Structure formats: C-alpha cells, structure tokens
Design a protein around this ligand. Structure first.
Ligand SMILES: Nc1ncnc2c1ncn2[C@@H]1O[C@H](COP(=O)(O)OP(=O)(O)OP(=O)(O)O)[C@@H](O)[C@H]1O
Ligand SMILES: [Mg+2]
Lengths: 310, 213, 327, 96
C-alpha cells in the first residue's frame, strides 16, 4: 500500500521513527543495479572483481546489505545439511592511522568476521601467517562472495605503483581461494578499476548512477520517489513534498540516501515538537550547507567525467 | 500352521506404556540390526496388568512374542537370545526364547490395524475387506466396541526425530474363516505395520479380554 | 509510485562450526587417516600448532574446571597424558573417547569415531596392539607429496603387527633418518610426514626386501578391520561377535568330527576359542593373537567375519569345511 | 592532544580515549579484545607499550559498540591538523 499503517499515529514517537528508519524504497536504479549484481554473483563468468562505484549516498551500503540478506536466505535451505559454509562475507575497509594502508589489520579483521579461533596466537607453517590463515579459511568455509566496503581506503599509499599493488595483494589472496571479491566504494575507486590486464579482464564494473536532473525520465523518477516518501512519512497529516522538488534536488544532488536522511531529520524534528505537518522552514532547518553540496557535486562530476570513458 | 513360528521371550523389567509400539521396535532394532530390514516379521502385543496412568505392569505371563518365518530365525536368534535392551531409561531383559506354533481357530482378532488414509469406521471396514479379498480369505468383518458400543480406536505414537506422528486404527474381529484361511490370516495379517506392533492376529479370546477392560 | 518495500532483517542461519569441517581421508578403506594425523591437519589448516589449537579449543571442553586462558600456556601432556601418549591414542582409550567426542561436537561431523577403535571397545584388547613410537612409510609420503596429495598417517601404521606397506612392500621406519631419534605421535608441532623433532623429511625411496608373506595375513586382516567399521552402519554388539566366534567353533568341531587329522592343525585354536567362549563375553578378545588366526584357519577374511550376517557366515563356513549343515 | 613531534600520535589518542571512556564502577567485566589491555587492582586499566596501535584501536571499537555512547566529544579538534604530508589531512579525517 502507498500509505503507512494507520495505527502508528496512536503509537509513541519512537515507534513511528523506527517504522520510518527500517523502511526503504526501491527506485529503478537501485533495483537495476541489484539485478545486475546478483546476476554477476550467480555467474561470475571468470571475473574475480565486481567493482561498484557510486556517489556518496546513492545506496551502496543498503544494496550491499540487501544482497547479503537475499543470498543468505537463498542459501539457507541447505546450510542445515552442510556446516562451515558461511554464505556471504561482508566487511568494511579501515582507513589507516599511519600513512600507508595496513594489511595485517585487514587480514585479522577478515579472520574475526569468519569467527576464526585463536587469531592472535596463530603460526606460520613454513604478515604471511595471517594471510595463509585467511586463504585457508576462505578455501574451507567456502563463501559465495566477499564484499569489501569503502574500497577507496585501499589506496591510502603514497606510492602510485603500490596503489595497484594493494589490489595485487587482494588478487593473490583471491586466486588461491577462488572467492569472488566485489569491492564497493566512492568515486575514488576509479583509479583502481582496470589498471593492468589482470584487473582489466577479471573485473566487471557496475556504476551506481545517481538521478541527474537533465533527463525528464530521471526527473519524473525523482518526483515519484518524493511522492512515495511523502505518502510513507508517518505523520498525522501528509505534507505536500512534490511541489518543492527543485529545493529537494538542490540539497540532495539526486542521491536517494541523502533525501532519506534529510527526511528522517525533518520527521524527527516534527515528532519531537508533536507537529502534524512538515513546513518549508522545517526542511530549511536541517538542510545541508551550500558549500557541502558544492563540494559533493564537484566530486561526483569529476567521477562521472572519469567514468564517461566509452 | 507349523510353517510359521511365534518367537516368545520371557520379558521382565519396568512398567511400559500401553502404546509402546515404536519404543520397543526401536529398542529391538537398536539391539538387532537385521530386524530393521526383514519383511515377514511381526510382534505380538505384550500382555500384563495395566495401571491407572495408561501403563502396563509386566507379570509372569508377560512376554515379548515375535512372528517370523522359520527360514529367518537364525538371523534374529543371536541378537535376542539372553539379550537385554533399554526403552528410554528402563532396562528390559529377555530369556532363552521358546517356539510356539501358529494354531488355527474358528474366529480371530487384532488389537490395532492401520491402513493409510482411512479414519472412518465404514471405509475402514471396506479397506479391511479389500485386503481380505487380496489374500484369498473368506469371513465376516466386525469392529471391537467399547462399553458404549462405539467402535474402539487405538492410537500409535511414532516419535520419529523431534516430531511425532499420529496414526489411528481399529480393532478388527473376523469370524468364520475355515482353519486354512484362518492360518493364512494370522500369518499375513492386515495393516502392514506388523513391525510397528499392530497387524498380528490372535485367537478370539483375547478380543474378549480387551473388551472386558 | 513504487509499492516495493524491502526488508533488511537478518536471517539467523544455523550456528557454524567452531573448527573447519575437514573431511577425513579414505574413510572406509585400508588407508584411513588416524585421529592424530587429522588433528595435525586441522591445526595446519588453521595456521596453528597442534598443541596451541588443543589448549585453545579442545582443552576447555575436555578439562572441565580450569581457566581457559591459564590453560593456553601449558604443555600438551597436561590434558593428553604423555606419560602414556604413544600411537595408542588411536586406540580405544578413555582420553581417545573424550577427544573424539569433543572433536565431533566442535565440527559437528559424524565420522571421526571411525578414525579410531572406540567402536571396538570391549571387543579387542588394548595391550600388545599399538606401537609405542611413531612409524611411517617413506615411499607413501614421497608418492603422496609428488602427486600433490594430502599427507597423513594411516591407522595401519600405528599397529605393532603392521610393519609393511602392501602398496610399496616397504618395511615401516620408526627412526628419523636425519636426527636419529624416534618421534612421539603427539608433539607441539608434528605435521604429517615431517620429523617432529628436527623438522627433517621422512619420505624416501626405501626398498623392502624381507619375507612379507609372514605378516601378510596380519596386515590384511587389520586393514580389513579398519576399512569395515565405517561400512557397518551401527555400533557393533559384543555378543554378536562372541556368537559368531562360537559358530566358528562349532563349525571347527563338526569338521574335526568329520576329519580327525584337522585336530592336529586346529587344536590350539580350538582351545583358545573355547577359553574365549568360557570367559566373560564382555571381555575383549586379542585381535592378532585370537581372531586373525581363527578366521585364517577358517579360511575366512576379517571382512567376511565382521560384515556378513549369521546366515551367510554359516553357509560360507559349511562350504569351506564341506559340511552338510544348513542354518 | 597537541603532539610534541610533527605527527599526531594516534596511539596516545586511542589509549586516552579508552582510559577516559572506561571509568565506571568495577562491576562491568567486559573482557576487551587484544591481550595487552586489562583492568588492575585499583580499577584503572593499563596498556603496555608493547601493544600496537591498531589493536588498541580495535579494542576501542569493541568498547564503544558495547557501551554505545550517544556522542563522542573531542575538544580543540584542530590538533588533528599537525602533520607533515599535505594530503595527510584527508587521511586523518578518513581515519576518524
Ligand atoms: N533507496 C533508499 N531508500 C531508503 N533509504 C535509503 C536508500 N538508499 C540509502 N538509504 C539510506 O542511506 C543510509 C545508508 O547509507 P547510503 O548507502 O545511502 O550511503 P553511501 O554513501 O552510498 O555509503 P557508504 O558511505 O557506506 O559508502 C541509511 O540511512 C539508509 O536508510
Ligand atoms: Mg553508506
């Protein structure tokens, strides 16, 4: 249904905020990228990298969690028979405190995710020990995919050639276990996509395109997502949000996640004051700064220009 | 007649539930692997004096009786002669077995018969008649009744895995068989769940025994 | 608008194994992996020493009331009992029992009990059965490593009466060629095929030039005994084996009744079987001393003795001694 | 903390965050990750210089997720700007 459950009005503010926060909408770009990603996951076709770009807030993390959950439930009917068979593994890269990216931390965090026993103690049967342990764990536990969120933090190295050596280490990890690695990150990842033939052949590139204001179809889609967000806003009265579509697009750049968090802020502000409708000044209170929007627009424009290679 | 034998064991131990079919069958299969694959085998109900809580107190005449072809006894005798088994947390012991013949009688009886997909009494009578013709047997079908006269149903609780399934059956009394057909009935039986402690047929006096109480 | 509303709730998959679910190699064959080799393989797969993994996970489940972290900094013997140790851990001893139980619980696997002889507890006497020191066939290890195959120690190598590898016809070697010392089966770090002390190699093309026919019956019988346990599908019943032995004794007695000369060949085994049938049946029987010679004189393989039912065993015995009986 | 050297010391920041966050009564026995961090007789946790900074960071992560504070306040945050590499400002902010 287009409307939120009607008994939520009588429920406290926390319940309404929860219903709004765990609610997510499927816009055409998100569902298309979801189908493409799962088609590539089901049939890797010899490609070991599924690099996914996107603006800050297009829904990369949400798509990652959705794919993890759906693959988990797809595999669920057979995990009772076969143990040590973790369906999917998804971890987030850590920006390094030091100047260069740390790989011991990466390996030990991956081991922590796989519930490896006695990680700290370890041994080297010959960070080589941690790398070998991760390789063996990936071989035996048999994960279907391996998401690595925030892949831009991989290239936190002062050496231009070691920038691709990070992916070389990841690739050497991948081959001896044959586990798909679908990295997710911002437009900073574009300097890692197709460097060298090894990363140019076995890498499939998916672009989480945002909703640009040029194509009338994308403008109509943005208006429709505004309409469905308005109809799913848990308020006593439904505020008219489609009219200020230009204002909503100005401070969100078409990023649906930005719209979601901004509307969450406005809804929480209204609920704290026990209001029944959303005013323009309510949106103006929690709108993003003009300089911030300019900076993210510059970044995504540069990323789109770099990715515009045909 | 003598071409089939009823293996009898003097059984002693703790008191036993009155719907103990799967319990004793599983215990016996635990202490006798070949029992799990045989075909023409069946177990007679275990006699005794019942209790108030739907449990049976084993007596001197209480005994485990197994119906088997005489050409398969050496596959069962090693694993049961003098052997003991556990039903849950209860210990049960079997003595040296003795052999009893398959005697014909004018009328027969079965304590519990189950055929898949038949719960009402009328269709149960029809199905028992169908199996009755399939064996080349002649007789009349009657259902043992409670004090109320209602046909008496008995229930078998198969506790397979975590779950447990319910199968309901009737007591069937068939008379006017002619001794050859009577023997054929006692040896074949009706219901199929003879390993499940149901389908064995007995002379008609035990029918009176069960109808009194 | 769009009516699709996704839900990202977790799915709560069943609990995963604490340790990797490594398959045991050649289960049901005369070359099954020993429990010690399986422990070392699991340790190698986890990039941990066998000792370290032991007190990391097996010790808290074995040693019930101790501080697990305080257990992490000890010697393997505190829980394994190196005062005994020996390749006899592969047998039917109590620590073997609890170790197998803990391992099967950790990986929720259902075949580790076949990697030992606890299925024959109360059936086969423990003494005079397993070597005190580690043994290996260098040809087997060299062939396995050259063929990029998994290195392991078969159960047969752990027995005193198995000294030769039928595949390579090579006498088992109990001493490391480099350090000159004899390896204990359990150690801090003893990967299969490696010298547990000097880390030297133990796989070389060693030729066996002895009379292997003398021990052939013993080694083949023990191999059949190991290979048959996983195929039974149940825990063996002691009186089943006792009554099979009694049936063989009756067949022997009938054969002697038909032919007097066979008494000269079978008197000692007749007396031994009679004693074994007069002593308590729950008492285990000496494998190599009693059962293997008994089935040998009966011209029956250990596989046939422990696998076939009473009807098949009786028929084959009657045919073997040309008796006219039919059970 | 304004650092004596030209580089912001993330190890000191991590250990000070851990010691400041971990000051409730002694009843909470959280059993943090990494072997190098534990309580003491007086209740004030101790961290040895042997412990590497990333492990201390991971312990801080575990402590923060377990305690779950509403907000982490950092005063005079401009001290994060004491570096030598020009691009290192982005690295510091990315670490935070
Ligand atoms: N299509 C959507 N519908 C509803 N909420 C969304 C949608 N896409 C994103 N969000 C919201 O955005 C937040 C998740 O962050 P999001 O994926 O948008 O950021 P990102 O910049 O792509 O990712 P990251 O910064 O982790 O790389 C959540 O609050 C989620 O509810
Ligand atoms: Mg995100």
């Amino acid at each position: 249904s287009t409307g939120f459950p009607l008994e939520l009005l009588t429920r406290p503010a926390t319940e309404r905020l929860a219903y709004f926060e765990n609610y997510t909408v499927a816009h055409p770009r998100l569902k298309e990228v979801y189908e493409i990603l799962m088609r590539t996951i089901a049939e890797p076709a010899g490609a070991s990298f599924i690099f996914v770009y996107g603006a800050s807030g297009v829904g990369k993390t949400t798509l990652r969690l959705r794919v993890e959950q759906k693959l988990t439930e797809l595999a669920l009917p057979k995990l009772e028979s076969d143990r040590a068979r973790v369906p999917v593994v998804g971890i987030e890269a850590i920006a390094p405190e030091s100047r260069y990216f740390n790989w011991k931390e990466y390996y030990t965090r991956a081991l922590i995710t796989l519930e490896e026993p006695l990680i700290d103690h370890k041994f080297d049967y010959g960070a080589p020990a941690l790398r070998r342990a991760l390789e063996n764990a990936l071989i035996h536990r048999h994960p279907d995919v391996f998401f690595v969120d925030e892949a831009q933090h991989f290239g936190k190295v002062a050496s231009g050639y070691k920038l691709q050596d990070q992916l070389d280490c990841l690739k050497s990890l991948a081959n001896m276990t044959g586990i798909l690695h679908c990295l997710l990150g911002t437009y900073e990842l574009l300097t890692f996509r197709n460097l060298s033939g090894q990363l140019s052949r076995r890498s499939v590139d998916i672009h989480f395109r945002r909703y640009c204001a040029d194509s009338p179809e994308d403008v109509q889609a943005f208006k429709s997502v505004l309409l469905t967000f308005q109809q799913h806003l848990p308020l006593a009265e439904t505020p008219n949000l489609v009219d200020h579509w230009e204002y909503f697009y100005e401070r969100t750049l078409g990023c649906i996640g930005t719209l979601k968090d901004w509307l969450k802020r406005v809804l929480s502000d209204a609920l704290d004051r026990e209001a029944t409708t959303i005013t323009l000044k309510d949106l103006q209170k929690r709108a993003l700064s003009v300089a911030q929007c300019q900076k993210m627009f510059k970044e995504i424009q540069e990323g789109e220009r770099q990715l515009s290679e045909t | 007649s003598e071409e089939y034998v009823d293996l009898t064991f003097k059984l002693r131990g703790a008191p036993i539930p009155l719907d103990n079919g799967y319990l004793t069958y599983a215990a016996l299969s635990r202490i006798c692997p070949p029992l799990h694959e045989l075909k023409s085998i069946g177990i007679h109900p275990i006699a005794g004096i019942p209790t108030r809580n739907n449990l049976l107190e084993l007596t001197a005449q209480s005994r485990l009786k197994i119906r088997i072809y005489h050409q398969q006894i050496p596959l069962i005798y090693p694993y049961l002669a003098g052997q003991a088994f556990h039903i849950g947390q209860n210990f049960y012991q079997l003595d040296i077995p003795d052999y009893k013949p398959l005697i014909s009688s004018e009328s027969v009886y079965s304590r519990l018969v189950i055929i898949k997909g038949f719960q009402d009494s009328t269709n149960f009578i029809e199905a028992v008649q169908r199996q009755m013709d399939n064996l080349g047997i002649q007789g009349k079908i009657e259902l043992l009744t409670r004090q109320d006269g209602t046909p008496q149903r008995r229930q078998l609780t198969i506790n397979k895995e975590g779950k447990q399934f319910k199968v309901r059956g009737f007591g069937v009394k068939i008379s006017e068989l002619n001794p050859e057909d009577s023997l054929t009935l006692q040896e074949q039986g009706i219901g199929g769940k003879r390993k499940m402690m149901c389908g064995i047929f007995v002379p008609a006096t035990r029918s009176k025994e069960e109808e009194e109480t | 608008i769009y009516s699709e509303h996704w839900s990202l709730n977790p799915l709560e998959i069943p609990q995963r194994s604490r340790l990797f679910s490594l398959e045991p190699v050649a289960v049901g064959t005369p070359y099954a992996e020993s429990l010690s080799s399986y422990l070392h393989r699991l340790a190698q797969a986890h990039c941990l020493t066998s000792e370290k993994l032991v007190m990391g996970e097996i010790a808290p489940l074995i040693l019930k009331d101790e501080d697990k972290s305080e257990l992490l900094s000890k010697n393997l013997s505190h829980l394994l009992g190196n005062s005994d140790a020996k390749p006899a851990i592969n047998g039917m001893r109590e620590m073997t029992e609890k170790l197998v139980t803990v391992l099967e619980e950790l990986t929720m696997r259902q075949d580790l009990r076949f990697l030992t002889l606890l299925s024959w507890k109360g059936m086969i006497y423990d003494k005079g059965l397993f070597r005190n020191y580690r043994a290996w066939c260098p040809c087997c290890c060299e062939e396995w490593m050259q063929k990029n195959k998994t290195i392991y120690e078969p159960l047969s190598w752990s027995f005193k009466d198995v000294e030769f590898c039928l595949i390579h016809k090579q006498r088992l070697i109990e001493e490391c060629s480099h350090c000159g010392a004899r390896l204990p089966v359990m150690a801090r770090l003893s990967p299969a095929g490696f010298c547990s002390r000097c880390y030297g190699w133990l796989g070389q093309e060693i030729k066996g030039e002895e009379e292997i026919e003398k021990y052939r019956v013993n080694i083949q019988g023990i191999s059949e005994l190991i290979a048959l346990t996983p195929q039974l599908g149940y825990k063996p019943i002691p009186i089943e084996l006792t009554r099979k032995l009694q049936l063989i004794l009756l067949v022997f007695e009938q054969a002697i009744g038909k032919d007097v000369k066979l008494l000269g060949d079978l008197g000692g085994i007749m007396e031994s079987l009679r004693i074994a049938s007069t002593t308590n049946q729950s008492q285990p029987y000496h494998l190599v001393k009693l059962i293997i010679p008994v089935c040998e004189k009966a011209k029956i393989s250990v596989f046939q003795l422990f696998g076939s039912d009473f009807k098949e065993l009786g028929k084959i015995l009657f045919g073997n001694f040309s008796l006219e009986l039919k059970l | 903390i304004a650092p004596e050297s030209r580089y912001f010391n993330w190890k000191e920041y991590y250990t000070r965050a851990l010691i400041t966050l971990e000051e409730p009564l002694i009843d909470h026995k959280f059993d943090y990750g990494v072997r190098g961090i534990s309580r003491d007789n007086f209740g004030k946790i101790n961290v040895e210089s042997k412990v590497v900074a990333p492990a201390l960071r991971r312990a801080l992560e575990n402590a923060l997720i377990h305690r779950h504070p509403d907000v982490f306040f950092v005063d005079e945050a401009q001290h994060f700007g004491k570096v030598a590499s020009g691009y290192k400002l982005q690295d510091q902010l990315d670490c935070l």
